[model samples]
Structures are given as structure tokens and as C-alpha cells.
Target: EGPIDKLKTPEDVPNDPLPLISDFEWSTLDIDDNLQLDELYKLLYDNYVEDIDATFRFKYSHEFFQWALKPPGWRKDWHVGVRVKSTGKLVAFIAATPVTFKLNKSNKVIDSVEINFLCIHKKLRNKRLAPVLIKEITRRVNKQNIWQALYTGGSILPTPLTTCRYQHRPINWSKLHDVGFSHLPPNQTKSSMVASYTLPNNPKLKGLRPMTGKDVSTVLSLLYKYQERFDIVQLFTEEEFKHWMLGHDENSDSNVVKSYVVEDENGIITDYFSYYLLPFTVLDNAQHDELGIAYLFYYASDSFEKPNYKKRLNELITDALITSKKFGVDVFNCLTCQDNTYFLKDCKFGSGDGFLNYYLFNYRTFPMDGGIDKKTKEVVEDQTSGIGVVLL
Candidate 1:
């Protein structure tokens, strides 16, 4: 009732049943129904993230929505979208998922929402609908008593909270080269490069297994204790941890989020790591099949403060990459967040050309260390970043 509803309905008669033409309007999306996610998916596909040429598109899975959108206290109102008032065609989407994000430039933990999926229809980008969507969602969030928001993107910032770089570990080097994501070096052959990225047939670590429901409380405890080392972090409740770390239904055949844990002689969880698959649909090439992609999500370890710290971490991530090959992952991506600096070079992850800029709305904080050197935007070896929060 408070937010602006600027949708123009061509009312032949005032307050009408139907209209022939309609103007842009904002509304809370009902994500429980398949229709809303269907439309939301279509809008983001063509216009979300892509290259200058129409080479690739993100294929955000439907299962991911069932996990990401319906968090512990998620609301339909936070799923803000724009559509033609009469036509009811969802054209733009910008959602806010409530989170308990902690800031450690320190001394505080506050209720926050991570703003995600801000997509404007390429055709309607000229309409500047982004501001409208931003404002409307802001009002709705404020009305619900939440004040701050966190988001990550490119270029874009108000002296961004953190400036991070994305790094990639190539799994299918030849497939990556086919999509122009990988290229043969002047001194190297394609086969050489492919072999260089090839991982072992089996995982190196022992006692590693898929995380089950029983491990939820123990894993969450491990995470809460480990994530404290970061300047920025998400304080996930037990339920939220289960949802984000495991999937909505762990027993399901297909899952968006996959998690694994390493337990020791005492039957206690020592380390846990996760990654989610959100692939891309390659275009133009007849080989324009789906490009399998995996992102390194939140991970925790008990060995961080030990002597064999990085070595142990390497084994876990190496196993992660090895396990990822089964998912058809041509590339695995992660950022200069957490203790990623120690592993990036050893894991054969090359710094991506793009920069991931983290920004906060309605709040100000000191410059957050992004795990990279300021002048060159390069990863600093043996260093850990203040950025602990992972934004999807």
C-alpha cells in the first residue's frame, strides 16, 4: 500500500476489468507458483550476464530458486519484479533475500538482505527501470524494518566495500577453448594446456563424503567458529545453514548446492566445503550446448591455525575440483575471498579479467581488504581477505 505502483493501465472505463495496453508496473512476485519463476528465468536469460557478442548466457537452474529464494524468513514481497500492468508479462526482477550479515571493520552484527538478480530487459534498459525497481524494493525492505543491503557486481560502486577478482580453474580445457574462454599460449600446444589442467581420477582426501542431515548442527558449529576470521561474514542460523549448505531436499536426485565434509578418528567433522552449479548455455556454435560451471561457495576448516594449514586446504580444494569433473564442469570459479589466496596459485586458478565489486547500501564502512594488492588488483600470496561473505 505504501510503495509506488506507477503502472499505467489504459482504462477505457475507470477502474476496469481488462485493458488492451499496459505500462510498466512493480509488484511482489509469488515465487511459490511455477509461473513466476518461469517468467523470471526468461527475463534473466537474455539480459542478465553475457559478453559483448551473444556467445554465452547463464542457465540459472529452477532448483536453485527453490533453495535460494525460500530462506528462513524470505518473503514474497522481497521478490520484486516489473511487468506490463495489463499484459502481466514479468520483464524485470530484483530480489532481496534476508540475511544476518556481520561487519568486521567490527563490533557489530545486523539484519541485512543480500540484493540479487537485478535484471532489466535489454529492450527496456533504456527505460531506466533499474532505479524504479531499486527504490521500490528499498521501500518494501524498509517497511519490514530492515535497513541495509549487500550486493556484488562489476564497475559499479560508491567506493565499493571490497574490490575482488574472480579466478578460474579450467576442468575441460579443450571445451573452454572451443567457447573462447581458453586460448592456446604462444609457446604451448592445446594438448599441453589441456593436460596441465587435468585433475586426478580420484579425490586425495580420505573420510570425505556427502553431507547428510545429521551433520547439519556439527557443520554449522564448525562454520560459525571458522568464519569468525573474516571481516565480513554471514551468520547463518541452523536452518539457513542446512538450506544453503545442503539443498532443500538432500535426498533429491539433482541438487544445486553440493556439500562434502571430512571427519577424523574421533568421528568429528574437521573440514567442509561446498560449490553450486549454475551453468551457461553457449550460443552461435553448434556445440552451443550447456557449459557446465561450478562456483566455490562457503567452506570451513579446523586446520586454518595450524602448521600444515595451506597444505591441508589444498587437498580439500583439489578434491573439490576432482569431484567437480563428474558434473561436467568445464570451468570452476571462485573469488579472492576467505583464505583463497593460499590456494589460488597452487590449484592452477588464473585470475579472471573481470573484477567483482562489493557494495553496501544505506550504510558505510571502512575499506575492506579484498585479498588482492590495491595498486595492481592482483592476489597477494600467503594472505587472507577480509571478505568472508559469498554473494550469489
Candidate 2:
């Protein structure tokens, strides 16, 4: 059996969430409210992932929340939260955003929701709130007639459609060393280590520049074709693509996302890439207050379909690394989920300690290759994994 028959109607759906335990109540978070946004940030900042040594915690800003949670067609009702009935304290949270996903190999396009930011307060972990939160979100999404969901987790769940290892490139070697994030290898000098990770001051790609409002349609077209190379990818409408690739608001000076495109001498858009920043607030560090971190986001290139594609991609990514430094990025992260295997080694990215597992809810499909050895989970050189979707 793949999935339960999705036959529920609006009349069959519940008008409100089920009653919580005696001390807790359900609350739909209003993300646009500054006070509520601060509460959400505090809840996550105190509970989210940390490095092995517990030296770092994710510093998610209000602007970042506005950018990520309020994409096109976002509904406040889906941003579920739990509160202590007595004190009115916000404790647990879960959310979903709409996405049009395509199963390329099977030739199926799904109107799905992407479930993310599932968090339960540390003290309430033993309460078994996670499953309840999931069920409520499912009920909400089901009411909208969307039966499928796409989610990723660092922890292994019931089943995974694909698993990809994390890769990191050190951008500020000295700063990383100072923060105990990097250690000097045997027989390697500090100067030598810094020199090895240094990148050129400027991008080498000709006609490369920041993406503008005018490039949205062209970039959307380029993205669709480039995404076809994989078995699973997100299908974005022009409006959704523009909103995600560009920003929710054009004039907002938020550094949460950065996108760039390459226009040739003939004024033809040849390639495009985007990366989002989510920094870590370092605790107890004497010299640094925060660590600037960037993740390799969506990208599309005409060069992927051309000869010498690998070489061109390497050069393009090299330029990406070089430009990222201007944003004060201390470390850059990417996954083996995309065609990154071609340049991971060439561009000096080392395997990270984390792995992200992709999951599809209420849907089943044959497992797809994740650009790694199925048994050992080592990177399979120069291969494109069947995954093209990037989850935050």
C-alpha cells in the first residue's frame, strides 16, 4: 500500500484543532506581528540545532522569518503554535508553506505543502507533542485539498526518499580557527591553511551581476529546464519563483537572500544562482559576536546542458564563493542533493558532520540515488542525484 486514499471533503474536515491537554492550548501564530515574531525567534533560538561542542546556535532574525515563512499563498492558520493556558507562554511550533512539486521521472506534478520548523520546547519533549503537531498540520493542509507534503530532517524518520550529506567550505579561515570551529592540520602552518582557503577578490564569470526584477521571467524559464535533469524537483509558478528567488518585498534591504545572474555580451541571460544567509550567534566567544553563514540555494545554468559543463560549473561556483566573501560569510554550506559532486572536491568543500534526509508525507515512491554510494554514503563523483528540490 502506498498511501491512504485521499477522499476527505471540506465538510468532513474539522473547523478547529482538537482540544489540548488541561494545561495547554492551541494558538495560530501571527508571524507579521513583531512581538509574535520575537517570541518565535526566542523559542527556536533556545531550542534549535547546535554544533557538536554546543558552541553555536542558529540566529534566525525577524527578517529571515518574514522571508521564509511568508512566501506566496502563505496562511497564518498553518503557522501552528501551542501555549500554556495559565501563563499564555508560547512553547511549541510547526508550520507549512505551499509548493508545486513535480516528480520528473513519473511525470507527475503535485500541489503539495512543505512542512518545516517543527520544534517543541526542551522541557516539553517527553510530552509527545511532535506527533500531535504533525497531525494538526495535516488536518489543516488536508482541509485545503493538498494531501502531500515535502519535508527534510537531520534525524532519521520512518522512511526517507533520499539522503544527502552536508558539505562546508570555510570562508574565513582565521576567524573559524579562533572560534574552535577549525583546527590546524599536522604539518600545516596557520598561514598555509589560510592561503589554501583564500579565494579571488572578484568573480571570474563575464557579465555576472546581481539579479533584478526584470530577470524574473527569464530566470524562471531557465530554472524549469535545468530542474528537468533530476527525478524530483519543485515546480514554481512565475510569481512564486520570483518571490522565492528575488524576495517577498523588493525594497526591503534584507540580506536574508542574495541572487545573481550571468548575462552574456549579447544581453542574453546565460546562468543564475541564489544563496540564503542564516548566521549562528556564537556564545562565549571573546572576539566574535556572530558567525556569518551562507547556504547554496537554487541555481540554473545553460552550461549544464552544454559540453564542458563540469568545468563551467566549477568556474561559476568558484565565482560564487568569491562573491560570498563580500557578504562576510565565514563558512558556506551545500549538500550532495544537487549536482554539487562535480565541484565539491575541486572547490575545497569538506564533508560535514551532518546529513539531511528527505521525506514525502502521504506519498510513496522508489528511492532515488542521492549522488552518493548507497552503502557507504560517500560522494559519487560527477553524478547528479535524482533530487533537485532544496529545503530550508
Over 4 Å off, model 1: 1-22, 50-53
How much RMSD separates candidate 1 from the native structure? Answer: 5.9
Indicate the residue-level lDDT of 200 in model 2: 89
Q: Let me know the TM-score candidate 2 reaches against the reference structure.
A: 0.96
lDDT of each: 0.81, 0.87
Taking every candidate in turn, the Cα RMSD to the unseen true structure, in Å, is 5.9, 1.5
Per lDDT, the best of the predicted structures is: 2
Residue 281 of model 2: what lDDT?
Answer: 88
**Clashes per prediction?**
0, 0
Would you give me the overall lDDT of model 1?
Answer: 0.81
lDDT of 2 at 102: 84
At residue 195, candidate 2 shows an lDDT of: 97
- TM-scores for all candidates? 0.91, 0.96
Candidate 2, 83-167: lDDT as tens digits: 9988899989999999888888778888989999998888998999988998899899989988888888876797689899988
Q: Write the per-residue lDDT of candidate 1 for residues 1-392, one digit (tens) a residue.
A: 11123333323223311222248666668978788778888888878863323787887777888888887888997898778776878888888989998776555788878888899888887877666676667666766767677777885755787888889999999988988888888999998998899789898888898888789999988988888888888887888888888777657744688799999888889999999998888887767587889999988999988999899988999999999988888999999899888899999999988788887776667777898999899888868788998887
